[PDB]
Amino acid sequence: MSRNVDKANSVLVRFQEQQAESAGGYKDYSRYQRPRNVSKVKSIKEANEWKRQVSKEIKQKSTRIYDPSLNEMQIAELNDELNNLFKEWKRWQWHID
Amino acid sequence: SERKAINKYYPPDYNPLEAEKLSRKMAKKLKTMNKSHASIRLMTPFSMRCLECNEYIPKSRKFNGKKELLKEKYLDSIKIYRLTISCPRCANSIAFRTDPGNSDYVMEVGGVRN
Amino acid sequence: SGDLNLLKSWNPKLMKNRKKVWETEQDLITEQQKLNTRLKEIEKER
Amino acid sequence: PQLEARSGAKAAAYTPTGIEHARLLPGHTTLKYRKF
RNA sequence: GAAUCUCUUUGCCUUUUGGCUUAGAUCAAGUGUAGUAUCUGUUCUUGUAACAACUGAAAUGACCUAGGCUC
RNA sequence: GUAUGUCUAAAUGCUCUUAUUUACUAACAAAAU
RNA sequence: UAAGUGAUCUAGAAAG
Numbered sequence: 228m229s230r231n232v233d234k235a236n237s238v239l240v241r242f243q244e245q246q247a248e249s250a251g252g253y254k255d256y257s258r259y260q261r262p263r264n265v266s267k268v269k270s271i272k273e274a275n276e277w278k279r280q281v282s283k284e285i286k287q288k289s290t291r292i293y294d295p296s297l298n299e300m301q302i303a304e305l306n307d308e309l310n311n312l313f314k315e316w317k318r319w320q321w322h323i324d
Numbered sequence: 325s326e327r328k329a330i331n332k333y334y335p336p337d338y339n340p341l342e343a344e345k346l347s348r349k350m351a352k353k354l355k356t357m358n359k360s361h362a363s364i365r366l367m368t369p370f371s372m373r374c375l376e377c378n379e380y381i382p383k384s385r386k387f388n389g390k391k392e393l394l395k396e397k398y399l400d401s402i403k404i405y406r407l408t409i410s411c412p413r414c415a416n417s418i419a420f421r422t423d424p425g426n427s428d429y430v431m432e433v434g435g436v437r438n
Numbered sequence: 439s440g441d442l443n444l445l446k447s448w449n450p451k452l453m454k455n456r457k458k459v460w461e462t463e464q465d466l467i468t469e470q471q472k473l474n475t476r477l478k479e480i481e482k483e484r
Numbered sequence: 485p486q487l488e489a490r491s492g493a494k495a496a497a498y499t500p501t502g503i504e505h506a507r508l509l510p511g512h513t514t515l516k517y518r519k520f
Numbered sequence: 521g522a523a524u525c526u527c528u529u530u531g532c533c534u535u536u537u538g539g540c541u542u543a544g545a546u547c548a549a550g551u552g553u554a555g556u557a558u559c560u561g562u563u564c565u566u567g568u569a570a571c572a573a574c575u576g577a578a579a580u581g582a583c584c585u586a587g588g589c590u591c
Numbered sequence: 592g593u594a595u596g597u598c599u600a601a602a603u604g605c606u607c608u609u610a611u612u613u614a615c616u617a618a619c620a621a622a623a624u
Numbered sequence: 625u626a627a628g629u630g631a632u633c634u635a636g637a638a639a640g
């Protein structure tokens with residue numbers, strides 16, 4: 228399990244995380260992938276967390292896309308990615324509450 | 325606390341099978357582990373030119389690549405891999421495949437061998 | 439040390455991998471031969 | 485590169501640490517003297 | 521004679537460099553050696569009539585000092 | 592000797608697969624009769 | 625006529 232990722236997703240760590248989730252309510256919304264279809268999330272806190280995560284992602288995307296080699300295609304691709312992120316964020320701002 | 329550590333501490337209630345099951349349940353949800361292009365450190369055997377900016381990355385030069393499994397295996401039961409690299413100057417994704425018929429590699433829309 | 443790749447699984451130039459490949463070929467090759475002969479026989483019969 | 489030679493050393497006084505160095509431990513408290 | 525500006529040469533300028541080590545080591549190797557880590561799919565989610573009762577909800581804004589009626 | 596750095600506003604249970612590993616790390620060391 | 629007594633080092637952990 229060299230290079231840290233393996234360590235992170237080693238069974239023991241996972242178990243610990245699960246335990247934390249069970250007792251006290253420590254989740255790491257960084258750690259899990261954000262769900263595709265909203266309205267399968269009855270809790271508000273979770274939703275908020277997800278929204279926050281997406282915002283963070285968007286910010287990250289923004290930070291990188293103004294790099295100096297602007298003509299490279301990665302940046303262009305991200306522009307679409309950025310849009311997608313924005314859309315997701317908007318969706319997360321649903322009007323149930 | 326020391327790299328050759330014999331026994332990692334477990335909680336007093338740790339049903340190992342149960343724990344494993346739990347992990348599995350929370351592996352589909354997991355971000356890492358449920359993805360492709362897992363990282364790797366590799367030297368470059370081909371000694372090739374980055375097709376965008378013509379940067380002549382020579383033999384044995386070290387990179388933090390991404391190894392990914394190619395679903396279409398060679399013959400039957402011997403896997404082949406895509407091994408992504410970036411050129412030093414321009415950030416173009418070079419990669420290569422390991423077709424073991426010739427005991428060597430194949431370039432994959434990254435650069436050219438010379 | 440020098441060449442790193444030599445201490446990797448994925449590296450085909452690693453000897454173990456090569457051996458495995460050979461084994462695969464050898465088995466498969468044998469099978470083909472077995473079938474090939476049969477095919478030939480069939481053709482002859484025809 | 486940064487593999488670099490040099491121009492001068494240093495000597496700047498801070499507050500003492502209060503650490504029990506091994507060598508600093510007492511030893512040869514008695515100073516000798518000459519005859520006169 | 522004095523003021524200034526432009527060009528050339530000399531002086532002054534990075535007419536080129538901020539360590540040491542076995543030129544630091546090697547342009548070779550079925551490697552060996554130590555360590556660190558766990559996985560494959562497939563699925564569960566009665567009508568009709570009569571009698572008793574109500575005729576209508578929600579939004580924010582117009583009055584008065586969160587509450588009270590009207591539109 | 593398993594490098595590192597930046598980046599952070601305050602669906603539920605179910606089971607079935609194994610005589611394995613898309614395993615990763617190379618800082619460590621390098622010869623013949 | 626007399627052999628064959630005794631001398632007994634060690635001892636693992638980290639980092640590199």
Ligand SMILES: [Mg+2]
Pocket residue numbers: 640
């Ligand atoms: Mg060192």
